[PDB]
Amino acid sequence: HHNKVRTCWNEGRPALAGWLQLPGTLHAEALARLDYDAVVIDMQHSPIDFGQVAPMLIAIELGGAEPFVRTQVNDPSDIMKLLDAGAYGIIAPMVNTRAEAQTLASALHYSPRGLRSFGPRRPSLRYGSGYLAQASETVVGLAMIETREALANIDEILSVDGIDGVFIGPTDLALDLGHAPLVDTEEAEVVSAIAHVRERAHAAGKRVGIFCGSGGFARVKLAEGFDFVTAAPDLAMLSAAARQVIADARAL
Amino acid sequence: HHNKVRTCWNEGRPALAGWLQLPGTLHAEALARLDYDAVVIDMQHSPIDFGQVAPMLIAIELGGAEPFVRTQVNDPSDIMKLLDAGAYGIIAPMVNTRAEAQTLASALHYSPRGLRSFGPRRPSLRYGSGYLAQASETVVGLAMIETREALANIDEILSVDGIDGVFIGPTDLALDLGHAPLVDTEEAEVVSAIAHVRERAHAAGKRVGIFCGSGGFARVKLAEGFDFVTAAPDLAMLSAAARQVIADARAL
Amino acid sequence: HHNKVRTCWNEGRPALAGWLQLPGTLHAEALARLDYDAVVIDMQHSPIDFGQVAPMLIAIELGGAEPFVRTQVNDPSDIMKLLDAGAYGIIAPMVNTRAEAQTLASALHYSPRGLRSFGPRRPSLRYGSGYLAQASETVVGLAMIETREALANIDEILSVDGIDGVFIGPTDLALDLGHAPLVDTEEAEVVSAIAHVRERAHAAGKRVGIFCGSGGFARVKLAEGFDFVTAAPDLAMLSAAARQVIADARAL
Amino acid sequence: HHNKVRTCWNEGRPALAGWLQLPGTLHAEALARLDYDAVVIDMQHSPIDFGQVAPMLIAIELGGAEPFVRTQVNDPSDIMKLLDAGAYGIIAPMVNTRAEAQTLASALHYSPRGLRSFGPRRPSLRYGSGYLAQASETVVGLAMIETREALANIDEILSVDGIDGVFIGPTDLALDLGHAPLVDTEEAEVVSAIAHVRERAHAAGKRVGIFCGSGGFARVKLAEGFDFVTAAPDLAMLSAAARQVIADARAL
Amino acid sequence: HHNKVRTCWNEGRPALAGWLQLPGTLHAEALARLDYDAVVIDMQHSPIDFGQVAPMLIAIELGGAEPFVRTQVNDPSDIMKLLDAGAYGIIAPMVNTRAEAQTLASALHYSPRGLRSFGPRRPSLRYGSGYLAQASETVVGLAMIETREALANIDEILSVDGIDGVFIGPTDLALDLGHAPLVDTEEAEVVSAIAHVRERAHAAGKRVGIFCGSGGFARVKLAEGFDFVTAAPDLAMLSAAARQVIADARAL
Amino acid sequence: HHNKVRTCWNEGRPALAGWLQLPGTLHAEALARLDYDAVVIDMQHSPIDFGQVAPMLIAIELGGAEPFVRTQVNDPSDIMKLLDAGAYGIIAPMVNTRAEAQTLASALHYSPRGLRSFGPRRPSLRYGSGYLAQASETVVGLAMIETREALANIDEILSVDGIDGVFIGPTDLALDLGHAPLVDTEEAEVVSAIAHVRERAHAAGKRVGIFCGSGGFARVKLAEGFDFVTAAPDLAMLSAAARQVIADARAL
Ligand SMILES: O=C[C@H](O)CO
Ligand SMILES: O=C[C@H](O)CO
Ligand SMILES: O=C[C@H](O)CO
Ligand SMILES: O=C[C@H](O)CO
Ligand SMILES: O=C[C@H](O)CO
Ligand SMILES: O=C[C@H](O)CO
Ligand SMILES: O=C[C@H](O)CO
Ligand SMILES: O=C[C@H](O)CO
Ligand SMILES: O=C[C@H](O)CO
Ligand SMILES: O=C[C@H](O)CO
Ligand SMILES: O=C[C@H](O)CO
Ligand SMILES: O=C[C@H](O)CO
Ligand SMILES: [Br-]
Ligand SMILES: [Br-]
Ligand SMILES: [Br-]
Ligand SMILES: [Br-]
Ligand SMILES: [Br-]
Ligand SMILES: [Br-]
Ligand SMILES: [Br-]
Ligand SMILES: [Br-]
Ligand SMILES: [Br-]
Ligand SMILES: [Br-]
Ligand SMILES: [Br-]
Ligand SMILES: [Br-]
Ligand SMILES: [Br-]
Ligand SMILES: [Br-]
Ligand SMILES: [Br-]
Ligand SMILES: [Br-]
Ligand SMILES: [Br-]
Ligand SMILES: [Br-]
Ligand SMILES: [K+]
Ligand SMILES: [K+]
Ligand SMILES: [K+]
Ligand SMILES: [K+]
Ligand SMILES: [K+]
Ligand SMILES: [K+]
Ligand SMILES: [Mg+2]
Ligand SMILES: [Mg+2]
Ligand SMILES: [Mg+2]
Ligand SMILES: [Mg+2]
Ligand SMILES: [Mg+2]
Ligand SMILES: [Mg+2]
């Protein structure tokens, strides 16, 4: 009866989340049962459509992590349908302006704070009759910062009330700056921008997150004060693990 | 226009294969593009049903590994439908007797060698008009040895003409012997049985395979002369990788 | 070869429709065979995506009710794809302005009345070669009135030619007015607004519908003159029925 | 970390279960959250295949009822795959002989008690490292008694160690006796047979269950001492509820 | 309220049926609306599993042809589940003996004529309360004759009461005789065997069918007196049509 | 490691493509293996949703044609998700203005040429580490011209840099001009408009395509100089083929 990520924050610690680009419920449950506070399902850069995401949300909740979705787009009705299917965290890509951030916020709250349409099929099952009064608190929302334009507008994005803060997409950000879209990059301009976004988010009293490609980079980000750190995509972890098993198997 | 595992064998080397318990095409293609000769899809201990296996076979072939299936059961019509969907390797569980091995063989060959029903939807697309004449060679079949009874009958199982040999299921085998179902076990009685099956398979001029849970164990099995070595299940590799990313991320 | 709801209207009676939030074809057909003129599939507050709605439309038609969809959003291309999949009634949520009502109308008619794209896969199978000439009549469209803003703009919404009228979403409407989102509410301000919308719809010579949560409320709405009354959601009816079976079973 | 039905029994009370013929997770979770100890998914007389049952098992567990399956057939490998997908109760239809009952039992226990193949994908996630030692206790198995032949062999069926008892299929039983296949029948010969099966099951110290079509009949069966009572199918409850809503809506 | 194929027969004409190896509802409905009396869905040599066949049965019925299935195997519980999903014709492959023909018949009739389990989800919706009394007549069953063994046993297969007759699988039959598995073959031994099966079926007062690969061959078979003629597989027709469109498009 | 359609163009010949309105992988692979340079999957006038398109892209690539999609709408995030699923050609419907053409172009190129978001799940598997540098060349984009408005704006649409040119939708175009939406029409005004669009596309040094309903019409279009010609929809070809098989079968 609490959003596990909001509970981390309220208790003075950051949240660590998984990141899924592969459809299906078995690995979603298995990863959720690990020491992840949340598991994010990626609906942008994956083959995961709505019909596949819906059972995954159930599986993550059963496993004991908060189900989050990184949506394909910042679209209010898409977001609302995920909320009603038991997505309790929403990370919306490519939020570049205050207005777009206000569109995200509008989907996450009922009237009068937002315009979320009422029909909370799965949240009502989870939270019971008192859901409406606590509904906003049950959902975490983060706007993604992934372009030079979003960088330019970061303080104004951060001034939007109905979102908890921002989530950096560092490979898109690197690419828009003219650099290779390398995860966990050391490119100075990208590193500088990432720090700046974190500094501005905290100056505004908001939360800041970042997508990580390794456990070591994630540790550093937590030490730097990021409130929400993901590490690492299921497909990338599995590929790397398989490459290593093959190398070990085929070694002389 | 050749079965990649049979090509390994014909060229004097063993085959290394992947092992999938998670449904979906993206990781299947990605793992197939690694230095695996085959990728086995597990339809026994997984949620993978026929509707999910069918696109995975396509994805593995595109990725450049031979698509194999470990079936739910040694059932001829199930096996035939997979063959016609472009499974080119069949590993049938719990083959305990010569008769059961003859049932497996019967599904893998057309008349007069077997009773496979004719309608090769995807093999005909892959191999063209000459498929019928080469059809038996396009498919690898292995009977699984997983019980004390299968151990007792190993020479008779190995005497069946229409299968390439046997595939050891070492966790089931350990359990039937009264030991913990540990993968890559060191339990002497299980290790002894595994060696014995390999020795008998080669004494019969047949192929022998084994399921491995790690790259190091797989290396040893290849050195011991196993012809077909799988390593390691996608779900197990992904779980272990995630546990390590989390440990690294949360370390002080 | 007629839209069953339009036939009710043309013959001087209202239409009673079912309302489905559960995916699947078996209950859709079974409910369609009851004395429902239409069955509405809810794609907003449900886990029903396009891949699941498509066979349900077939099942409702076979069962003998007109297949309707309440869409996730008032989006023209989404609506057109449903029309071509054999949705013959469209209820679009959250239609708040004349312009948004004109967007809905544009999707429901071919040129020159609208901009519906031509490729009527299933309507052409149902209606044959004469489909094009009668296509507009084969589809019912209703704009949903669910906010204070939609209330403010009701006469202008009702002035849009290409829609048959409006469909009240009374739980959203109650919530936007600051009241509990109770179905079949007695809250005076909400009841007053609902009556007003009905009065304005009929003053404009248009049709008016309303979502009901019970058979008794639905009877009253029909008596008040609503032209299209839904009652009641499959999930709500099933839950209530199960609660009662359990109470009866566990009673002393 | 306990099978909820076995816990009822161990604590001196019967279990009441739901019964689902409609695929999908939303109603499965919603019904599971009611005061049902278990929810049975019917894979015999429904369109529910393996790909649809798998997420339903997850949803029922999350909702707080024990997930059960009435299988299509008493087939060991089918049953094992459901066990590994997190079915914790198995009701097998048309168990007519001691041998068939022994086949059911063989699938539900690992060696040496049975021949269940080892790869417990979801039970291991639920129960953790100690699963193997408690695995038999985590699963309930019931053989269905549905024919004159099963009646003739009831004591011998009941003598099989590895099943908890029997589950009466009273419409099939009525039909095989030459009577209408009416649920909750009053036909004396069928009523007499049902009582006899219950009496013999308890004389053998085993559990007995029965499929019910109403809450009142279910109450009587619990009073008569049945240990496992289902009531009533989702589709039948929903159909009846819809018929009543329509009758109420269309009444003058 | 009648099986369209049985109506052909009762009215003194043969039945012509379609044959589908491609999953999906759109072409199934479209072909059903043509002058086919039935459409057969092939679950043996196709990727069509149960989850895909179920909506196709609905679509064929809506289109106005009798839905038939050629099953993967002659398995009673598989057949019963299709019957309850609204398959009204069953063609079972590889029926080689009287006993196997008796197994097929047993699945198609309720007690006392057969052992079909009672739960007719979709037939009860189609036929209403009087279904039970007419259930046998609503289903057509044909045993496939596809091997030398089935040829050897043809009179005994034909003596089985509960099946309408036999359906020749001529490519399998050719292959078992040592000839190329060519559809619509002119190979004398195969042609002779096909005629013999027809002659014996009619000498027994039973129905006989045959799979055809072209409209011309199908015409000849109807003229020779076959009672049930299929022509031709959707995939084969579509492939041939596409080849011709390409040849026409690329011609100088 | 090349887009097959771009290779046609670079080598001085047009491309001929298939057109699929039926979901599924088997016919997609089979048609791809014919002498089609590309196969277009229609997501506008079909029941093909994202979950169904994804495996079809894999199947077309394996078959040896370039996978293209005609999307439901010109929506950047929809297009990006298809690109990352291995759509290598995008045909966007109802592109009516320069601005809408610029929206299409923006989705097809990474920064700085466009705003495509980075996460190329399947293109990176196909093209390897050098993908980013060649990514724009791997994708073909065409804007559809289907209205009087698009005709009015054709030169301005053609002036957009990031698209290869335009694709005529001639049935929509005919309908918007007030004529019957006949494929391969002879209506002078429509024929004149089609020629004009081709002439303007080539005057701008861009590519022009057209949807054809027959091989003969397609031949003429290639002779007239169209660079990308589709012929003909799978459903239309299959329907016509079945009608002819039935006519031949039922002829005296
Ligand atoms: O739309 C209204 C609610 O979602 C019905 O449950
Ligand atoms: O459960 C949902 C809300 O609390 C009802 O108003
Ligand atoms: O069954 C015969 C063949 O499979 C038809 O293609
Ligand atoms: O392609 C299949 C076989 O070769 C035809 O006989
Ligand atoms: O787009 C054109 C039509 O839909 C083709 O059937
Ligand atoms: O069927 C569709 C239309 O009537 C053809 O113009
Ligand atoms: O078959 C062996 C086990 O299931 C692998 O996880
Ligand atoms: O989790 C499964 C078993 O307990 C491992 O032996
Ligand atoms: O099994 C009994 C019947 O199918 C319940 O509807
Ligand atoms: O509908 C099914 C049967 O007729 C009921 O006995
Ligand atoms: O979003 C970032 C990338 O897609 C992660 O793989
Ligand atoms: O594979 C994708 C790109 O080339 C990495 O930058
Ligand atoms: Br952990
Ligand atoms: Br699902
Ligand atoms: Br990464
Ligand atoms: Br590698
Ligand atoms: Br598929
Ligand atoms: Br392992
Ligand atoms: Br009724
Ligand atoms: Br479907
Ligand atoms: Br309600
Ligand atoms: Br309750
Ligand atoms: Br699932
Ligand atoms: Br019932
Ligand atoms: Br026709
Ligand atoms: Br379905
Ligand atoms: Br053929
Ligand atoms: Br060709
Ligand atoms: Br897929
Ligand atoms: Br066409
Ligand atoms: K956790
Ligand atoms: K490989
Ligand atoms: K009706
Ligand atoms: K419960
Ligand atoms: K017909
Ligand atoms: K090709
Ligand atoms: Mg990004
Ligand atoms: Mg095993
Ligand atoms: Mg609403
Ligand atoms: Mg029964
Ligand atoms: Mg055959
Ligand atoms: Mg068009």
Numbering used by the authors:
A (entry chain A), B (entry chain A), C (entry chain A), D (entry chain A), E (entry chain A), F (entry chain A): 0 to 251
Sentences from the paper on this structure:
Here structural analysis of hydroxyketoacid aldolase from Sphingomonas wittichii RW1 (SwHKA) revealed a dynamic movement of the metal cofactor between two coordination spheres without protein scaffold rearrangements. Holo‐SwHKA forms a trimer of homodimers, in which each monomer adopts an (α/β)8 triosephosphate isomerase (TIM) barrel fold. In total, holo‐SwHKA contains six equivalent active sites; each of which is formed from amino acids from two different domain‐swapped dimers. The transition from M2+ R to M2+ A,S is induced by bidentate substrate binding and occurs without a concomitant rearrangement of the protein scaffold.
In the presence of ketoacids, bidentate substrate coordination affords M2+ A,S as the lowest energy complex and predominant state in crystal structures. The M2+ A,S complex is additionally stabilized by side chain interactions from the protein environment with the coordinated substrate. With d‐glyceraldehyde (DGA) and HPA in the active site the position that phosphate occupied is fully taken. The DGA is in a similar position as phosphate, interacting through hydrogen bonds with R69 and R120′ from the adjacent monomer. These interactions, and in particular the hydrogen bond to R69, orient the aldehyde for the nucleophilic attack by HPA. In SwHKA the equivalent loop (residues 117′–121′) is shown to tightly interact with the aldehyde molecule through R120′. Whether these interactions are associated with SwHKA stereoselectivity for the (3S,4S)‐isomer is unclear.
